[PDB]
Amino acid sequence: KKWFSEFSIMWPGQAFSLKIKKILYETKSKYQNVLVFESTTYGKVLVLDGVIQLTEKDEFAYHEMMTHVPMTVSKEPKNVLVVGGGDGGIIRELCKYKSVENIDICEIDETVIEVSKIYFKNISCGYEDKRVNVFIEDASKFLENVTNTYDVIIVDSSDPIGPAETLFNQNFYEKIYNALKPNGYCVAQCESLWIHVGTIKNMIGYAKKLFKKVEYANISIPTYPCGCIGILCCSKTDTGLTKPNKKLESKEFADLKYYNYENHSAAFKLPAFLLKEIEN
Amino acid sequence: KKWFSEFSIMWPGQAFSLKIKKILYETKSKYQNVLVFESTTYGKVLVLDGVIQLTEKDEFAYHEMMTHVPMTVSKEPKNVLVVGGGDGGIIRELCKYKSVENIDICEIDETVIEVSKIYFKNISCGYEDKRVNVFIEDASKFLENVTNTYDVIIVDSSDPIGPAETLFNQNFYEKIYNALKPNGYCVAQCESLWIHVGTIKNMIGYAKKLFKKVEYANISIPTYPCGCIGILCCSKTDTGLTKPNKKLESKEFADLKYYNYENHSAAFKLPAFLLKEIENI
Ligand SMILES: CSC[C@H]1O[C@@H](n2cnc3c(N)ncnc32)[C@H](O)[C@@H]1O
Ligand SMILES: CSC[C@H]1O[C@@H](n2cnc3c(N)ncnc32)[C@H](O)[C@@H]1O
């Protein structure tokens, strides 16, 4: 009985392994190597170019924090875009907001959507919502001509090596800024504070050229390297994304497993060493 | 270059590994297998029975949260007990409080204190402080017949597989409770909320039979399984441990790399699923 090991040039000197119960699917798509397996203790796992993208056991932490942070701050969002996120976990959490009109997703790799629909039904269930519109395209190309459209943009990308390489540069952030409404918000997956603080500082700096308020939050998730991942939070208004404007009290939100009102703000209380690195 | 991989029945089906620059020391003590190695990206690493105890790069997160949460709540803590903690990290943090009068440490395995002096001098530097008294004993035995003595008890244990087994039971918590002053506090290492909910529920339940207010806080640390570890927070007053009564702003605290006043309280804002489980204790 074998183990899967996640080793990368992006985090050298460390590795995380999961014991494999069985391999479910492996193929090479037009864009990336795609592996799906049942682990013995974290449920099903999705792997792209040898990097864990999700497990069934902990995916809610990431998907709920990335969605409910901006969606409890934006008032009356009508148009939201997911960049990347082919598994559909973000769309799942977005569907819970009954007054959103259009959920647009731009995913480069249609094989990730297919596989998610087949093997991760509890994640990909939102694709059935008739408000969902799917665009199969490089988001960097998709966003190049959009302006003044989205209330919230959620960048749920894979890591900078592979097709997401176009999503971690200044030009992309300008596109996000322009694609947003005047009071719109963006959140984006961003490097772990335990790995490359220099990358976080680079990303904050690209955002701060455009956005009035740029903040960083941490989410605990055991199957990403170092057991955590950042959220780069970008606001066009001065008030930012640290404090929710509403409580998720309706029935669609009863079963949340991570997010709540208090932990929203707590997510932005970062270790002292990081604060010092990003203050200056 | 070889890798070190951390396997345990306490975390089946997963493992974290670190690339080994060089092996520094390996010995079987009277109690456990002791390993020290230099990793390629985390510095030196202390391993006990095949489980990572600390690394140089991230040890401050655990030692600072474990220490400064109770020490900023207790108003005038003069006598403090560390259980376990042979490496010295909690003692280092405690020595920063000039107003502390006495620090007792009870550590079962003196080889771990010896190894820490040799290979972890930036962690073991407090053993030189003249306030520090060292007892080499199973803390379960040590605390029999200690009563109404400590303002703070900090239980920096290894995992419950091995000699720390005697620290993860109701009997231990009766001793802690008796050894603390009437407004004393205890904090105890209490495992990962991603995989140890069973243990976390058992421990909180033992503490709740004695203490009026029992809380749980989480610390981000990448070299413990799941990238986090919790603090079982035990108070004899109803106000508990979530709000500090002092700030760490003086020179002695200039070097803090994790803890601050907001982070203290934020540590206790737990994931929704964990809150639901703690409701079922
Ligand atoms: C699984 S969540 C991360 C996703 O980001 C998608 N992705 C990577 N690069 C891009 C890109 N340039 N545009 C849109 N989606 C992308 C990946 O194919 C993956 O499904
Ligand atoms: C390295 S910090 C953890 C410390 O807890 C110590 N320890 C484990 N069990 C006990 C015990 N029953 N009493 C005191 N210290 C202990 C271990 O030897 C280790 O040095």
Residues in chain A: 280
Residues B40, B79, single domain; the answer is: no
Greatest CA separation found in chain B? 54
B231 - beta bridge partners? B189, B217
Mutate to test the pocket of ligand 2, among B45, B110, B112, B153 (most ligand atoms within 8 A of CB): B112
- Cα–Cα distance list, A232 to A99, A191, A219, B238 (Å): 25, 9, 11, 38
**Shortest-distance ligand to the CA of residue B89:** 2
Spatial contact of A74 and A184, defined as CB atoms under 8 Å apart: yes
Residues 6+ apart with CB under 8 A from A144: A175
CA distance B142 to chain A (A): 35
The edge-to-edge listing of strands for the beta sheet with A132-136 is: A132-136, A102-107, A79-84, A150-156, A180-190, A228-235, A213-220
**DSSP tag of B140:** H
- Mention every residue, 6+ apart, whose C-beta is less than 8 A from residue B102: B78, B79, B80, B131, B133
Beta-bridged to residue B230, according to DSSP, are B218
- Closest chain B C-alpha to A255 CA, distance in angstroms: 9
Identify the H or E element spanning B217. Answer: strand B213-220
> Is B4:B39 a contact under the CB 8 Å cutoff?
yes
Burial of A245 by CB count in 10 Å (0-12 exposed, 13-18 middle, 19+ buried)? exposed
Residue A223: closest CA among A99, A64, A57: A57
B14 three-class SS = strand
Q: Are strands B132-136 and B102-107 parallel, antiparallel or unpaired?
A: parallel
How many angstroms separate the CA atoms of A62 and A155, rounded?
A: 12
**Does one domain contain both B67 and B166?**
yes
A141 and A95, same domain (yes or no):
yes
- CA–CA distance, A164 with A83 (Å, rounded to integer): 10
Pairing between β-strand B150-156 and β-strand B180-189 as defined by DSSP bridges: parallel
Verify whether the Cβ–Cβ distance B220 to A222 is below 8 Å.
no
* CATH number, residue B116: 3.40.50.150
Torsion angles phi and psi, residue B55, rounded to 5: -130, 155
Residues B211 and B259 reside in one and the same domain = yes
Helix, strand or coil for residue B199? helix
Whether the CB-CB separation of B265 and B72 falls below 8 Å is answered with no
SS3 content of chain B, % helix, strand, coil (to 5): 30, 30, 40
Q: Are residues A94 and A29 in the same domain?
A: no
Asked if the Cβ–Cβ distance from B19 to A3 is below 8 Å, we say no
Q: Which residues pair with B220 in a beta bridge?
A: B228
Is the domain of A43 the same as that of A91?
A: no
A30/A197 Cα distance (integer angstroms): 32
Which amino acid makes up residue B201?
A: K
For A197, the token pair is: 């603080």
Ligand 1 atom with least separation from CA of A164: 9
Ligand 2 centroid vs B168 CA: distance in angstroms?
12
| Method used experimentally | X-ray
Which residue is closest in CA terms to ligand 2's atom 16? B84
Dihedral angle computed from the Cα positions of residues A165, A153, A129 and A38, in that order, rounded to the nearest 10 degrees:
40
Q: Which residues of B119-151 are buried (b: 16+ CB within 10 A; e: fewer)?
A: bbeebbbbbeeebbebeeebbbebbeebeebbb
Return left, alpha or beta for B94; rule: phi > 0 is left, psi -120 to 50 is alpha, else beta: alpha
Q: Which domain holds residue A41?
A: 1-57
Q: Are A228 and A194 in contact (CB under 8 A)?
A: yes
Nearest to A240 by CA among A169, A165, A186: A186
Smallest CA separation from ligand 1 atom 16, residue: A84
Task: Give the residues surrounding ligand 2 with Cβ less than 6 Å away.
Answer: B 53, 83-87, 106-109, 112, 138-140, 156-158, 163-164, 166-167
Q: Which residues of B touch A192 (CB under 8 A)?
A: 222
Amino acid at A16: F
Same domain, A53 and A89: no
Residue A243 is given by DSSP the state: S
Chain B contacts of A39, Cβ < 8 Å? 13
CB A230 less than 6 A from any atom of ligand 1: no
The two structure tokens encoding residue B132:
């520090």
Integer Cα distance of B231 and B113 in angstroms = 23
Alpha helix segments (H runs only) across chain B: 59-73, 89-95, 110-119, 139-142, 170-179, 197-208, 261-266, 272-278
d(C-alpha B69, C-alpha B73), whole Å: 7
Residue where a domain terminates, one of B57, B73, B96:
B57
Structural contact between residues A179 and A210, judged by C-beta atoms closer than 8 angstroms? no
Residue with tokens 């929203």: A264
Question: Nearest to residue B42, comparing CAs of B259, B223, B226?
Answer: B223
Residue that is written with structure tokens 């290979």 in the block? B119
The Cα A223–Cα A5 span in angstroms is 11
Breaks in chain B after residues (C–N exceeding 2.5 Å): none
Whole-angstrom distance, CA of residue B56 vs CA of residue B65? 16
Alpha-carbon distance A160 to A8, whole Å? 12
Same domain flag for A117 and A172 = yes
Domain count across chain A:
2
Report how far residue A181's alpha carbon sits from residue A186's, in angstroms, rounded to the nearest whole number.
11
The gap between the terminal CA atoms of chain B, to the nearest Å, is 46
**Is A138 near ligand 1, meaning CB less than 6 Å away?**
yes
Q: What's the gap between Cα A27 and its chain centre?
A: 23
Q: Which of A13, A58, A270 sits opposite B194 (nearest CB)?
A: A58
CB A80 within 8 A of CB A109: no
Q: B39 to chain A: which residues are within 8 Å by CB?
A: 13
Q: Is B162 left (phi over 0), alpha (psi -120 to 50) or beta?
A: left
The CATH number of the domain where A11 resides is what?
A: 2.30.140.10
Same domain flag for B129 and B44 = no
For A201-216, letters b (16+ CB in 10 Å) and e give: ebbbebbeebbebbbb
Q: Are residues A222 and A142 in the same domain?
A: yes
Residue nearest to atom 8 of ligand 2 (CA): B164
- Which tokens is B274 given? 């964990």
Cα gap A113→A87, rounded to integer Å: 6
Backbone angles phi and psi of B186, in degrees to 5: -125, 140
| Domain final position from A57, A72, A97 | A57
Per-residue CA distances from A176 to A70, A210, B112 (Å): 15, 10, 53
DSSP class of residue B41? S
Give chain A positions within 8 Å (CB) of B256.
272
Q: First vs last Cα of chain A: how many Å apart?
A: 49
- Using a 10 angstrom Cβ sphere, with 0-12 exposed, 13-18 middle and 19 or more buried, the burial of residue B63 is buried
Buried b (16+ CB within 10 A) or exposed e, A54-93: bbbbbbbbbbbbbbbbbbbbbeebebbbbbbbbbbbbbbb
Instruction: Judge contact between A31 and A163, C-beta under 8 A.
Output: yes
Q: Is A227 helix (H, G, I), strand (E, B) or coil?
A: helix
> To test ligand 1's pocket by mutation, which of A47, A62, A104, A112 has the most ligand atoms within 8 angstroms of CB?
A112
User: Are A191 and A160 contacting, i.e. CB atoms less than 8 angstroms apart?
Assistant: no
What does the H/E/C string look like for A123-185? CCHHHHCCCEEEEECCHHHHHHHCCCCEEEEEEECCCCCCHHHHHCCHHHHHHHHHHEEEEEE
Q: Is A115 in the same domain as A195?
A: yes
Element (H, E) at A218: strand A213-220
- Rounded Cα distance between A68 and A84, Å, is 17
The closest of A90, A99, A115, A106 to A176, measured between CA atoms, is: A106
Q: How far is CA A191 from CA A11, A165, A212, A228, A262, in A?
A: 11, 14, 21, 9, 23
Question: Is A16 within 8 Å of B12 when comparing Cβ atoms?
Answer: no
The residues after which chain A has a C–N gap greater than 2.5 Å are none
Q: CB burial class (10 A; 0-12, 13-18, 19+) of residue B253? A: middle
Q: Does A129 appear as a known binding residue?
A: no
Angle A170-179/A197-208 helices, nearest 10 degrees? 40
* Crossing angle of helices A197-208 and A272-279, rounded to 10°: 40
Spell out a b/e string for A116-127, using b for 16 or more CB atoms within 10 Å of the CB, else e. Answer: bbebbeebbbbb
Please report which residue ranges of chain A form alpha helices under DSSP H: 59-71, 89-94, 110-119, 139-142, 170-179, 197-208, 261-266, 272-279
CA proximity to B158, closest of B26, B13, B18, B33: B33
> Domain check: are A41 and A63 in the same one?
no
CA B228 – CA B62 distance, rounded (Å): 9
